[PDB]
Amino acid sequence: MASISEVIRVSLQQEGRAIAPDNMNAVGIITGNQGVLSTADRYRIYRTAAAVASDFGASSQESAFANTFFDTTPNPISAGGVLVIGYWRSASETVAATSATLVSEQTSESVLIPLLNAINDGSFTITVDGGTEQEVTALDFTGVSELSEVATILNSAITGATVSEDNGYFKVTSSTTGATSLLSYLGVATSGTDISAVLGMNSESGAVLTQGTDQVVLPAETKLEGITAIKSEVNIKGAMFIDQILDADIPGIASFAGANNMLVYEVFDTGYLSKNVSNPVWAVKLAGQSNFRCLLSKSGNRKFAATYMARMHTVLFSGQNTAITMQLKELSVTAEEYTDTEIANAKTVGLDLLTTIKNEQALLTSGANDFCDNVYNLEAFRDEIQTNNYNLLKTTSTKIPQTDPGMDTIEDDTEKTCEKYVRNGVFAPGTWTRSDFFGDRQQFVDAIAQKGYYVLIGDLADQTTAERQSRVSPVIQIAVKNAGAVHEEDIIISVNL
Amino acid sequence: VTAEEYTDTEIANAKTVGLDLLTTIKNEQALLTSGANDFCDNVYNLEAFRDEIQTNNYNLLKTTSTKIPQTDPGMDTIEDDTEKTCEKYVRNGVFAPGTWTRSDFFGDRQQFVDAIAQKGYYVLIGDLADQTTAERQSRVSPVIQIAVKNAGAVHEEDIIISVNL
Amino acid sequence: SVIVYRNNQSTLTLNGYTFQHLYQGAALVLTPVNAKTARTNSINGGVSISGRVDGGVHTLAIMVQKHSPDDKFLNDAKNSQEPVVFDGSMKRAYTESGTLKKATTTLETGSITTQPTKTDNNQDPDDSRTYVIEFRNSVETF
Amino acid sequence: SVIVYRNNQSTLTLNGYTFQHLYQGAALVLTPVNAKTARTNSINGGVSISGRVDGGVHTLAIMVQKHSPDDKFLNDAKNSQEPVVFDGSMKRAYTESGTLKKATTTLETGSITTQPTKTDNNQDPDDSRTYVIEFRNSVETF
Amino acid sequence: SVIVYRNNQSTLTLNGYTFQHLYQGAALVLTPVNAKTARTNSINGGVSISGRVDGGVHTLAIMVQKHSPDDKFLNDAKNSQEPVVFDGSMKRAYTESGTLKKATTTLETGSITTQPTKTDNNQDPDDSRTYVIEFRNSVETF
């Protein structure tokens, strides 16, 4: 009565695990419900709406935003990206005090089992610090094939503290919560053969030991500016907020977007349709805070941000032609009704409109603030230049010198990335409109008109010894020209009869 | 031989304690091996490999009728004999090129992993220099070090199928 | 015109790896395999100008030390399971009159196309590994 | 880079028999008969990279003494009823900077492909038997 | 290896007649017209070895005195009504180390295939009759 299910195991609906990518399009939806995520649980990464709901609940707001995100047929995941959800302390953050926690660094299951199998006896010295320090010897691991088994043996070995295994990590937590310390890193008992060293939780061994907090803690309500934390830990590039961002915070979050090198999509109702300074969006435009993208919804449909964020970021930056605008792209939220005057106003104040054309979804971008395509492309470009330069320099295992050949290498790295982008759809060769330049007009305009980019690196000569010993190359100067995106067409037709 | 009848729990136990099972799948003879102890394919292949290396080296050396010296060319000959056998085995199905998982190695990391990822084997013979006169007069070459990587054998397949409607 | 170069040879780098063991004596050489434009020419002052699709296709012959980091890189490229694309640049620094200009030539997707003819002598030393990476676009700019 | 070889010539051995009478003056030579990858190249920055099946096919020209154990082995190979496969290796020892590395090149199934042009003179001595064993895979590693 | 020949040139005899007026300066030369085995080579470590039927086909170029018993024999062969088959041997004597060995090469059914290019000068003496007898089997043994 044996079964297939042991040699050919076939199942349904398994969520592929998601990992934080280097990819540009690992976007973020920041929520304000402490129901599932804590300050410590600052974020969580997802690749499927199903798992999103199964963690939050299909009735949750976050769930609905996840659906509206995942329904955009070009989905950020389609370009090797992930969704994340963050958390900012909207309300009184109650944090129940937990117990002291001990973790093993050594995730490797395979290497651990044989060493435990060979050792018949054991020795083990923990301190719950709740009194007598533990002296634990009678340890056998011969019958263990899996980490769960050694975990359970340890559980039966340590009083007042449950142990367990999570993903190659060994968690040891005392039963008492609040101001109880598991200081010991398993020590050594003179009464047997130790497991501590092989267990990887020695004092010398790297191990996180979060001593039990005193009592429950109440972090004060942070601001939406507390988004600083999220990028501090996830390296997202496209952020949101469940709530509407209050106007006084708008310049602050805009500056944050400009500095921390990411996008922030936000919507506004028709009230903010003006060229007035008091209107925050026009303030953004006049300030050049081009990373703070402003959107329009008469309903104030915050979900409209999702399908927006989910539609811009679908781009791979390695294929032949992939730089997309967003003029007239299919989105996953019902369009609204507008009359002409605020269509034009939205066009001239930077907002974007999801409306009806020929009874169809029609998303129109604006150029008052910088184009969505332009800002997103530039931002991914700068981040990619930074990362290609970084991994050229510290992980290539052959550190590049200040040899003029080496300086040429570091120039070629960015030149190669610029190639990747001109052969991508973001930059195209053409005349240079601007007046400011570097190096010399002739080579500058010649390269831009021919190659579409120009990288000129400062000479080692022009760098003083003071910063040479600082081990920093000269400041490379790269100049790019966007590829034109058709958004308008105007044509006039006469009738010769 | 006629297969027998087992329930699930000892199927899994046998899989995780090294035994092998001749049972029924879709009303058919089904032999399942285990990996708790080393794979049957792996141990048998390795064993034939070691014995074959020993025999090719032996008959290179006493029946070839042209005894090979401690000339560095001759040491290269004795290296090539085992390299040729390793070729015979990579071109056999036992070893395949690939990254080296282990940490221990010999010679130097770069050539080691490069050859394994490319040729699937690496033979490095100790230099005549590193051998003392005491064992040279013993007429024994340096200790050759050969490193091989098994070819992966598919035993499991797990696949998940959704229905877009 | 007046002209002087730094950088004795055109410093070269493929796949972010720079060639630094160049066989002395004209190691690098770029050859245009084809024309830049073929034409058909008809009667009475009429021609047709058509730039071919093989415009920049240039073969780059590299001469490197018989067993060098550069030859190690090129060889590991040669023996890969999947032939490895080559992207990079050949460029020189040079001061025109007083102004310092840089003459660069990109090298797009390319690959091995003639292995070195491995020759070992006894009379005379020979450490001459000549690879030929032939790309498709080789645009010089300056 | 800095480099020095032991083993004047690449010590060579086919079928577990080592060549020890090598005609002085560049006896061994490995030639790649074909490319490593042919490409078709279409418009507007597009190419297709395909490593041929003749990748490693290398001819090895051997020069040996007119009547030597090495020429005896090669000749008995040449005159066999069934052409004898050749397997073996060409390799050199060499110390990179202080570390001692070995550069090896396997030679898979190969065979005679050009007999020596047997020349006998009176003016001048000539003991130059040049065989050409051309294999299919010749992978250098180091 | 150590080796020394008696018999300055490979003493040669066709049809039981021995060549004794050999133009000094590399008169005899044996050339293999073809390979010993052609191969077709398919993917993933696979080749096919096939020894051709033209294996031993060797051309023997002979240089003889302009009007000599040797040239008389070769000429009378050339002008026969029916082309005369040539059978015989090229061989040398040689002492390996102390042992005396004989290196012989048979020459099966062969015939004239290029007449001498009869040149007569006045500036300079020229007595150089070069025949080419190309056989089918030329097996050297030793």
Coordinates of C-alpha atoms in Angstrom, one line a residue, chain A:
Chain A
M1 CA 0.0 0.0 0.0
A2 CA 3.0 2.2 -0.6
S3 CA 2.5 5.4 -2.6
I4 CA 3.9 7.7 -5.2
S5 CA 4.0 10.5 -2.7
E6 CA 7.4 9.3 -1.4
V7 CA 9.4 9.2 -4.7
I8 CA 7.4 11.7 -6.8
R9 CA 6.0 14.2 -4.4
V10 CA 3.4 16.3 -6.1
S11 CA 1.5 19.0 -4.2
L12 CA -0.5 22.2 -4.9
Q13 CA -0.3 25.8 -3.9
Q14 CA 3.1 26.2 -2.4
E15 CA 4.4 29.8 -2.1
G16 CA 7.9 30.2 -3.4
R17 CA 10.0 31.9 -0.8
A18 CA 10.9 35.5 -1.5
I19 CA 14.3 37.1 -0.8
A20 CA 15.2 40.8 -0.8
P21 CA 16.7 41.5 -4.2
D22 CA 19.2 43.9 -5.6
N23 CA 16.6 44.6 -8.3
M24 CA 15.4 48.1 -8.8
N25 CA 11.7 47.0 -8.5
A26 CA 11.4 45.7 -5.0
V27 CA 8.6 48.1 -4.1
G28 CA 7.1 48.8 -0.7
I29 CA 3.6 49.3 0.7
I30 CA 3.8 50.8 4.1
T31 CA 1.0 50.0 6.5
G32 CA -0.3 51.4 9.7
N33 CA -1.8 48.3 11.5
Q34 CA 0.2 46.9 14.4
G35 CA -1.9 43.7 14.2
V36 CA 0.8 41.6 12.5
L37 CA 4.0 43.6 12.2
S38 CA 6.1 45.1 15.1
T39 CA 8.9 47.6 15.3
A40 CA 11.2 44.6 15.2
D41 CA 9.0 43.0 12.6
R42 CA 9.6 46.1 10.5
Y43 CA 8.8 44.5 7.2
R44 CA 8.0 41.3 5.3
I45 CA 8.7 40.3 1.7
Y46 CA 6.0 38.7 -0.5
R47 CA 5.7 37.3 -4.1
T48 CA 2.1 36.2 -4.1
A49 CA -1.2 37.8 -3.1
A50 CA -2.3 34.5 -1.7
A51 CA 0.5 34.4 0.9
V52 CA -0.1 38.1 1.6
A53 CA -3.6 37.4 2.7
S54 CA -2.7 34.1 4.4
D55 CA -0.4 36.2 6.6
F56 CA -2.6 39.3 7.0
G57 CA -6.1 38.0 6.2
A58 CA -8.1 38.4 3.0
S59 CA -10.3 40.9 4.8
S60 CA -7.3 43.1 5.7
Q61 CA -6.7 46.5 4.0
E62 CA -3.1 45.3 3.3
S63 CA -4.7 42.3 1.6
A64 CA -6.8 44.5 -0.7
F65 CA -3.8 46.6 -1.7
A66 CA -1.9 43.4 -2.4
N67 CA -4.7 42.3 -4.7
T68 CA -4.8 45.6 -6.6
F69 CA -1.0 45.4 -6.8
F70 CA -0.9 41.8 -8.1
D71 CA -3.5 42.3 -10.7
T72 CA -1.5 44.6 -12.9
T73 CA -0.8 42.3 -15.8
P74 CA 2.8 43.6 -16.1
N75 CA 3.6 42.9 -12.5
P76 CA 6.8 44.0 -10.8
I77 CA 7.5 40.4 -9.9
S78 CA 7.5 39.6 -13.7
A79 CA 10.7 41.6 -13.7
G80 CA 12.3 39.7 -10.9
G81 CA 11.0 42.0 -8.2
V82 CA 9.3 41.5 -4.9
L83 CA 6.6 43.2 -2.9
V84 CA 7.3 44.2 0.7
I85 CA 5.1 45.5 3.5
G86 CA 6.6 47.8 6.2
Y87 CA 5.2 49.2 9.4
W88 CA 5.3 52.6 11.1
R89 CA 3.9 53.0 14.6
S90 CA 0.6 54.7 13.8
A91 CA -0.8 54.0 17.2
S92 CA 0.4 53.2 20.7
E93 CA 2.9 50.5 20.1
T94 CA 2.5 48.0 22.9
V95 CA 5.3 45.5 22.9
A96 CA 4.9 42.6 25.3
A97 CA 8.1 41.8 27.1
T98 CA 9.6 38.5 25.8
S99 CA 12.2 36.1 27.2
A100 CA 15.9 36.0 26.7
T101 CA 16.6 34.4 23.3
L102 CA 19.7 32.4 22.1
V103 CA 20.4 31.6 18.5
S104 CA 23.0 29.5 16.7
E105 CA 24.7 31.0 13.8
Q106 CA 25.3 27.7 12.0
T107 CA 22.4 27.2 9.7
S108 CA 24.1 24.2 8.1
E109 CA 22.1 21.1 9.1
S110 CA 24.3 18.6 7.2
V111 CA 27.5 19.3 8.9
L112 CA 26.0 19.1 12.4
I113 CA 24.4 15.7 12.3
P114 CA 27.5 13.4 12.0
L115 CA 29.3 15.2 14.8
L116 CA 26.3 14.7 17.1
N117 CA 26.0 11.1 15.9
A118 CA 29.6 10.2 16.9
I119 CA 29.3 11.7 20.3
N120 CA 27.6 9.3 22.7
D121 CA 27.5 11.3 25.9
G122 CA 27.4 15.1 26.2
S123 CA 28.0 18.1 28.4
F124 CA 26.2 21.3 28.4
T125 CA 26.2 24.4 30.7
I126 CA 23.5 27.0 30.3
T127 CA 22.4 29.6 32.9
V128 CA 18.8 30.7 33.0
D129 CA 20.1 33.0 35.7
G130 CA 17.0 32.1 37.6
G131 CA 19.1 30.4 40.3
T132 CA 21.5 27.5 40.1
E133 CA 23.5 27.5 36.9
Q134 CA 22.6 24.5 34.8
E135 CA 24.9 21.4 34.6
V136 CA 23.6 19.3 31.7
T137 CA 25.4 16.1 30.7
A138 CA 23.2 13.1 29.7
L139 CA 23.0 14.0 26.1
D140 CA 22.8 11.4 23.3
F141 CA 22.4 12.3 19.6
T142 CA 22.9 8.9 18.0
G143 CA 19.3 8.5 17.0
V144 CA 19.1 11.9 15.4
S145 CA 18.7 12.5 11.7
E146 CA 17.2 16.0 11.8
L147 CA 17.7 19.2 13.7
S148 CA 14.3 19.0 15.2
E149 CA 15.4 15.9 17.1
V150 CA 18.5 17.5 18.7
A151 CA 16.2 20.5 19.4
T152 CA 13.7 18.3 21.3
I153 CA 16.6 16.6 23.2
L154 CA 17.8 19.9 24.3
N155 CA 14.3 20.9 25.3
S156 CA 14.1 17.9 27.6
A157 CA 17.6 18.8 28.8
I158 CA 17.1 22.5 29.8
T159 CA 14.6 23.3 32.6
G160 CA 12.5 26.4 32.3
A161 CA 13.5 27.0 28.7
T162 CA 12.0 25.7 25.5
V163 CA 14.3 25.1 22.6
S164 CA 13.4 24.7 18.9
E165 CA 14.7 24.9 15.4
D166 CA 13.8 27.6 12.8
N167 CA 15.6 27.4 9.4
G168 CA 19.0 26.3 10.6
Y169 CA 18.7 28.4 13.7
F170 CA 18.5 27.0 17.2
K171 CA 16.3 29.1 19.5
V172 CA 16.6 28.8 23.2
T173 CA 14.1 30.8 25.2
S174 CA 13.4 30.7 29.0
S175 CA 9.9 30.1 30.1
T176 CA 9.9 33.3 32.2
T177 CA 9.3 36.6 30.3
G178 CA 10.6 39.9 31.4
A179 CA 14.0 40.7 33.0
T180 CA 15.2 37.1 32.9
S181 CA 18.7 36.5 31.4
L182 CA 20.1 33.5 29.5
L183 CA 23.6 34.9 29.6
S184 CA 25.6 31.7 29.2
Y185 CA 26.8 30.7 25.7
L186 CA 26.4 27.0 26.7
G187 CA 29.8 27.0 28.4
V188 CA 31.5 23.7 29.1
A189 CA 30.8 21.1 31.8
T190 CA 33.7 19.2 33.3
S191 CA 31.4 16.2 33.6
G192 CA 31.2 15.2 29.9
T193 CA 32.1 15.8 26.3
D194 CA 30.8 19.2 25.3
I195 CA 28.3 20.0 22.5
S196 CA 28.7 23.7 22.9
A197 CA 31.6 24.2 20.5
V198 CA 30.1 22.1 17.7
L199 CA 26.7 23.7 18.4
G200 CA 28.1 27.0 17.3
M201 CA 26.7 29.1 20.3
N202 CA 29.9 29.7 22.2
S203 CA 31.0 33.0 23.6
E204 CA 33.7 33.2 21.0
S205 CA 31.2 31.9 18.4
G206 CA 29.1 34.6 16.8
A207 CA 25.6 34.4 18.4
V208 CA 22.8 36.8 19.0
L209 CA 21.6 36.7 22.6
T210 CA 18.7 39.2 23.1
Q211 CA 18.6 39.4 26.9
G212 CA 15.0 39.5 28.2
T213 CA 13.7 43.0 28.3
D214 CA 12.5 44.4 31.7
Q215 CA 8.8 44.9 30.9
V216 CA 6.4 45.7 28.1
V217 CA 7.6 48.8 26.2
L218 CA 5.4 51.5 24.6
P219 CA 7.3 53.2 21.7
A220 CA 5.7 56.6 21.1
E221 CA 3.8 57.0 17.8
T222 CA 6.4 57.8 15.1
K223 CA 5.8 59.9 12.1
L224 CA 5.4 58.8 8.5
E225 CA 9.0 60.2 8.3
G226 CA 9.7 57.1 10.3
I227 CA 9.8 55.5 6.9
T228 CA 13.6 56.2 7.3
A229 CA 13.6 52.9 9.3
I230 CA 12.1 50.9 6.4
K231 CA 14.8 51.8 3.9
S232 CA 17.2 51.3 6.7
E233 CA 16.5 47.6 6.6
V234 CA 15.0 46.5 3.3
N235 CA 16.5 48.7 0.5
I236 CA 13.1 49.1 -1.2
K237 CA 12.8 51.5 -4.1
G238 CA 9.1 52.3 -4.4
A239 CA 7.2 53.2 -1.3
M240 CA 3.6 53.9 -0.4
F241 CA 1.5 54.8 2.6
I242 CA -1.9 53.3 3.4
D243 CA -3.0 56.6 4.9
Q244 CA -3.0 59.9 3.0
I245 CA 0.2 61.9 3.8
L246 CA -0.7 65.0 5.6
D247 CA 0.3 68.2 3.8
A248 CA 2.8 69.4 6.4
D249 CA 4.7 66.1 6.0
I250 CA 4.7 66.3 2.2
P251 CA 7.9 68.4 1.9
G252 CA 9.6 66.3 4.5
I253 CA 8.8 63.0 2.8
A254 CA 9.7 64.6 -0.6
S255 CA 13.1 65.6 0.6
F256 CA 13.5 62.1 2.0
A257 CA 12.7 60.6 -1.3
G258 CA 15.2 62.8 -3.0
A259 CA 17.9 62.0 -0.6
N260 CA 17.4 58.2 0.0
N261 CA 17.2 57.6 -3.7
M262 CA 13.8 56.0 -4.2
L263 CA 10.3 56.9 -5.5
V264 CA 7.2 57.6 -3.4
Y265 CA 3.9 57.5 -5.1
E266 CA 1.1 59.5 -3.6
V267 CA -2.5 60.4 -4.6
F268 CA -4.6 63.5 -4.0
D269 CA -8.2 64.5 -4.5
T270 CA -9.3 67.3 -6.7
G271 CA -8.8 69.8 -3.9
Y272 CA -5.1 69.9 -4.6
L273 CA -5.7 70.9 -8.3
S274 CA -4.0 74.3 -8.4
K275 CA -0.8 76.2 -9.3
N276 CA -0.9 77.7 -5.8
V277 CA 2.1 77.4 -3.4
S278 CA -0.3 76.5 -0.6
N279 CA -1.1 73.4 -2.7
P280 CA 1.6 70.9 -1.7
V281 CA 1.9 69.2 -5.0
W282 CA 2.7 72.5 -6.8
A283 CA 5.2 73.1 -4.1
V284 CA 6.8 69.8 -5.0
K285 CA 7.0 70.8 -8.6
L286 CA 8.5 74.2 -7.9
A287 CA 11.0 72.5 -5.6
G288 CA 12.2 69.9 -8.1
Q289 CA 11.4 67.1 -5.7
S290 CA 10.9 64.9 -8.7
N291 CA 11.1 61.6 -6.8
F292 CA 7.8 62.4 -5.0
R293 CA 5.3 61.3 -7.7
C294 CA 1.9 62.9 -7.3
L295 CA -1.3 61.2 -8.5
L296 CA -5.0 62.2 -8.8
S297 CA -8.1 60.4 -7.8
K298 CA -11.4 62.2 -7.3
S299 CA -12.5 59.4 -5.1
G300 CA -9.1 59.6 -3.4
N301 CA -8.6 56.0 -4.3
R302 CA -5.4 55.1 -2.5
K303 CA -5.5 51.7 -4.3
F304 CA -4.7 53.8 -7.4
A305 CA -1.2 54.2 -6.1
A306 CA -0.7 50.4 -5.9
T307 CA -1.6 49.6 -9.6
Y308 CA 0.5 52.6 -10.4
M309 CA 3.6 51.4 -8.4
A310 CA 2.9 48.0 -9.8
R311 CA 2.9 49.3 -13.4
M312 CA 6.0 51.5 -13.4
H313 CA 8.5 49.2 -11.9
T314 CA 8.0 46.3 -14.3
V315 CA 11.3 46.6 -16.2
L316 CA 14.4 44.4 -16.3
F317 CA 17.2 46.7 -17.3
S318 CA 19.0 44.0 -19.2
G319 CA 16.8 43.3 -22.2
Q320 CA 17.0 44.9 -25.6
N321 CA 14.3 47.6 -25.3
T322 CA 12.5 47.7 -22.0
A323 CA 12.3 51.4 -20.8
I324 CA 8.6 52.0 -20.7
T325 CA 6.7 55.2 -20.2
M326 CA 3.4 55.1 -18.4
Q327 CA 1.3 57.1 -20.9
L328 CA -1.8 54.9 -21.4
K329 CA -0.9 51.8 -19.6
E330 CA -3.4 49.2 -18.3
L331 CA -4.0 49.6 -14.6
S332 CA -6.1 47.6 -12.0
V333 CA -8.5 50.2 -10.6
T334 CA -11.6 51.7 -11.9
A335 CA -11.1 55.0 -13.7
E336 CA -13.0 58.1 -12.6
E337 CA -14.8 61.0 -14.3
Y338 CA -13.2 64.4 -14.9
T339 CA -14.1 67.4 -16.9
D340 CA -11.6 69.1 -19.2
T341 CA -10.4 71.9 -17.0
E342 CA -9.0 69.7 -14.3
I343 CA -7.6 67.4 -17.0
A344 CA -5.5 70.3 -18.2
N345 CA -4.7 71.5 -14.6
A346 CA -3.5 68.0 -13.7
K347 CA -1.4 67.9 -16.8
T348 CA 0.2 71.3 -15.9
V349 CA 0.7 70.7 -12.1
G350 CA 2.3 67.3 -12.2
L351 CA -0.5 65.0 -11.2
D352 CA -1.4 61.9 -13.2
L353 CA -4.9 60.9 -14.3
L354 CA -6.7 57.5 -14.7
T355 CA -9.7 58.4 -16.8
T356 CA -11.9 57.3 -19.7
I357 CA -10.9 57.4 -23.4
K358 CA -13.1 55.7 -25.9
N359 CA -14.6 53.8 -22.9
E360 CA -11.3 52.4 -21.8
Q361 CA -8.8 52.7 -18.9
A362 CA -6.4 55.6 -19.8
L363 CA -3.5 56.6 -17.6
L364 CA -2.0 59.9 -18.5
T365 CA 1.2 61.2 -17.0
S366 CA 2.5 64.8 -16.9
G367 CA 5.6 66.7 -17.5
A368 CA 5.3 69.5 -15.0
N369 CA 7.2 67.4 -12.6
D370 CA 9.7 65.3 -14.3
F371 CA 8.3 62.4 -16.3
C372 CA 7.7 59.1 -14.5
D373 CA 9.7 57.2 -17.1
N374 CA 12.6 59.7 -16.8
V375 CA 12.8 59.8 -13.0
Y376 CA 12.5 56.1 -12.6
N377 CA 15.0 55.3 -15.3
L378 CA 17.5 57.8 -14.0
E379 CA 17.1 56.5 -10.5
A380 CA 17.6 52.8 -11.4
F381 CA 20.6 54.0 -13.5
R382 CA 22.3 55.8 -10.7
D383 CA 21.7 53.0 -8.2
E384 CA 23.0 50.4 -10.8
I385 CA 26.1 52.5 -11.5
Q386 CA 26.7 52.6 -7.8
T387 CA 26.3 48.9 -7.4
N388 CA 28.3 47.8 -10.4
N389 CA 31.1 50.1 -9.2
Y390 CA 30.9 48.7 -5.7
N391 CA 31.0 45.1 -6.6
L392 CA 33.8 45.8 -9.1
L393 CA 35.8 47.0 -6.2
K394 CA 35.3 44.9 -3.1
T395 CA 34.0 41.5 -4.2
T396 CA 35.9 41.0 -7.5
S397 CA 38.8 39.6 -5.2
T398 CA 41.4 41.5 -7.4
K399 CA 41.4 44.9 -5.9
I400 CA 41.8 47.5 -8.6
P401 CA 44.7 49.9 -8.1
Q402 CA 45.2 53.6 -8.8
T403 CA 47.2 52.4 -11.8
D404 CA 46.1 54.4 -14.8
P405 CA 45.1 51.0 -16.3
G406 CA 43.1 50.5 -13.1
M407 CA 41.5 53.9 -13.4
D408 CA 40.7 53.0 -16.9
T409 CA 39.1 49.8 -15.5
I410 CA 36.9 51.8 -13.2
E411 CA 36.0 54.1 -16.1
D412 CA 35.1 51.1 -18.2
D413 CA 32.9 49.6 -15.6
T414 CA 30.6 52.6 -15.7
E415 CA 31.0 52.9 -19.4
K416 CA 29.8 49.3 -19.7
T417 CA 26.8 50.0 -17.5
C418 CA 26.0 53.0 -19.7
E419 CA 26.2 50.7 -22.7
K420 CA 23.8 48.4 -20.9
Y421 CA 21.4 51.3 -20.6
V422 CA 21.7 52.7 -24.1
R423 CA 21.2 49.1 -25.3
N424 CA 18.2 49.1 -22.9
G425 CA 15.9 51.9 -24.1
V426 CA 16.7 54.6 -21.5
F427 CA 19.3 56.6 -23.3
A428 CA 19.8 57.1 -27.0
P429 CA 22.5 59.0 -29.0
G430 CA 21.6 62.5 -29.9
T431 CA 22.6 66.1 -29.8
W432 CA 23.2 67.6 -26.4
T433 CA 20.7 70.4 -25.6
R434 CA 22.3 71.6 -22.4
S435 CA 25.2 74.0 -22.2
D436 CA 27.0 72.8 -19.1
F437 CA 29.4 69.9 -19.8
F438 CA 32.8 68.6 -18.8
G439 CA 36.1 67.6 -20.4
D440 CA 35.7 69.5 -23.6
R441 CA 32.7 70.4 -25.8
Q442 CA 33.9 68.5 -28.8
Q443 CA 34.4 65.0 -27.3
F444 CA 31.3 65.5 -25.1
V445 CA 28.8 66.3 -27.8
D446 CA 30.5 63.8 -30.2
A447 CA 30.2 60.9 -27.9
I448 CA 26.6 61.8 -26.9
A449 CA 25.6 62.2 -30.5
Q450 CA 27.3 58.8 -31.3
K451 CA 27.3 56.6 -28.2
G452 CA 24.5 58.3 -26.2
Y453 CA 26.7 58.6 -23.1
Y454 CA 30.0 60.0 -22.0
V455 CA 32.1 58.9 -19.1
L456 CA 35.1 61.1 -18.2
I457 CA 37.1 60.2 -15.1
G458 CA 39.3 62.7 -13.3
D459 CA 43.0 62.1 -13.7
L460 CA 45.0 60.7 -10.9
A461 CA 47.1 63.8 -11.3
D462 CA 44.3 66.2 -10.3
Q463 CA 43.8 64.3 -7.0
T464 CA 45.9 65.4 -4.0
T465 CA 47.8 62.9 -1.9
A466 CA 45.5 63.8 1.0
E467 CA 42.6 61.9 -0.6
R468 CA 44.7 59.3 -2.4
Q469 CA 45.6 57.9 1.0
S470 CA 41.9 58.0 1.6
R471 CA 41.7 55.3 -1.1
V472 CA 39.0 57.0 -3.2
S473 CA 39.3 57.3 -6.9
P474 CA 38.8 60.6 -8.7
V475 CA 35.2 61.8 -9.2
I476 CA 33.9 60.2 -12.4
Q477 CA 31.6 62.3 -14.5
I478 CA 29.0 60.5 -16.6
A479 CA 26.6 62.3 -18.9
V480 CA 23.5 60.7 -20.4
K481 CA 20.7 61.7 -22.7
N482 CA 17.2 60.2 -22.4
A483 CA 15.5 58.5 -25.3
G484 CA 12.5 60.4 -26.4
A485 CA 9.1 58.8 -25.6
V486 CA 6.1 59.6 -27.8
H487 CA 3.2 60.8 -25.8
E488 CA 1.5 63.3 -28.1
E489 CA 0.8 63.2 -31.8
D490 CA -0.7 66.1 -33.6
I491 CA -1.5 65.8 -37.3
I492 CA -3.6 67.8 -39.7
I493 CA -5.4 66.4 -42.8
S494 CA -6.7 68.4 -45.7
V495 CA -9.1 67.2 -48.4
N496 CA -8.0 68.0 -52.0
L497 CA -11.7 67.6 -52.9

